[PDB]
Ligand binder design. Structure first.
Ligand SMILES: C[C@@H](O)[C@H](N)C(=O)N[C@H]1[C@@H](O)[C@H](n2cnc3c(N)ncnc32)O[C@@H]1CO
Ligand SMILES: C[C@@H](O)[C@H](N)C(=O)N[C@H]1[C@@H](O)[C@H](n2cnc3c(N)ncnc32)O[C@@H]1CO
Ligand SMILES: [Mg+2]
Ligand SMILES: [Mg+2]
Lengths: 136, 136
């Protein structure tokens, strides 16, 4: 699993066209204030342990930034070893569930299987932008 | 070299703290209207051929999107096989130079070696967000 952690002053997205024949989540849109935005690419090897490591690391990083909102943003583009879409959807649901057991703030998982427009204002401090890899 | 192509309605950045002992570019800030924003991670193997392939592909993609502004945005976080900073700076300068021989619009290379805040509004059409790899 490859993640990009972006500490935003604000974030919003809107689903536009379907990217999958039948997206498993409904269309919609949402906007946020200060949040850790986690662009998340699920990789072929990802299983339960990978999800638990990532949930721990996101919670720990959120804690040190003192953010109380996490956005789990499905992203196809961080890796060249993608899981298939149905496995990726399942892992992202698991990740959202695991993160709730480790992090006490707002957890928002964005819809899977859509093209989306988005806007972000990302902070420019030294820890505002980091990448992570998790495996089992 | 790993790139992320983001077709933006608007983009702006500001350098904040130095990320390198002595950044090779001066601090500053800039904002743009519609642009292809190219987040660019230079990798250990990158040489002249890699720069020429990437310059061709960015020009060709810009052409099909009908954009007339390209932002070359140095980014540490797209890969786990980074070139050293002085080689990466040199390759990004080469890339800017090569892209000018292939693409007739505004080319803006952002300063290397800074932490930066940024804002982007990214379009949500099917080709608004793509990743690329180039090697030799
Ligand atoms: C494209 C851009 O506008 C938007 N942000 C998008 O990337 N959409 C992706 C994810 O929502 C999802 N998806 C499919 N496979 C995966 C995977 N392995 N990991 C994560 N997400 C996946 O399915 C869409 C098809 O690429
Ligand atoms: C960090 C974030 O706010 C900002 N956007 C940033 O990423 N800054 C990077 C690039 O400007 C540059 N840099 C160093 N090595 C490389 C490399 N191999 N490829 C590209 N850039 C590099 O040096 C800084 C140190 O990571
Ligand atoms: Mg809508
Ligand atoms: Mg300034």
């Amino acid at each position: 699993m490859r993640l990009l952690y972006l500490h935003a002053d604000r974030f919003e997205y809107k689903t536009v066209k379907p990217a999958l024949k039948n997206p498993p989540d409904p269309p919609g849109e949402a906007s946020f204030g200060e949040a850790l935005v986690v662009f998340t690419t699920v990789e072929d090897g990802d299983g339960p342990q990978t999800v638990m490591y990532a949930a721990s690391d996101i919670a720990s990083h959120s804690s040190r930034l003192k953010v109380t909102t996490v956005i789990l943003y499905p992203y196809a583009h961080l890796s060249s070893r993608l899981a298939k879409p149905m496995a990726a959807h399942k892992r992202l649901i698991e990740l959202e569930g695991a993160l709730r057991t480790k992090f006490p703030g707002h957890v928002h998982r964005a819809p899977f299987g859509w093209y989306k427009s988005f806007s972000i204002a990302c902070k420019g401090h030294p820890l505002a932008e980091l990448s992570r890899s998790f495996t089992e």
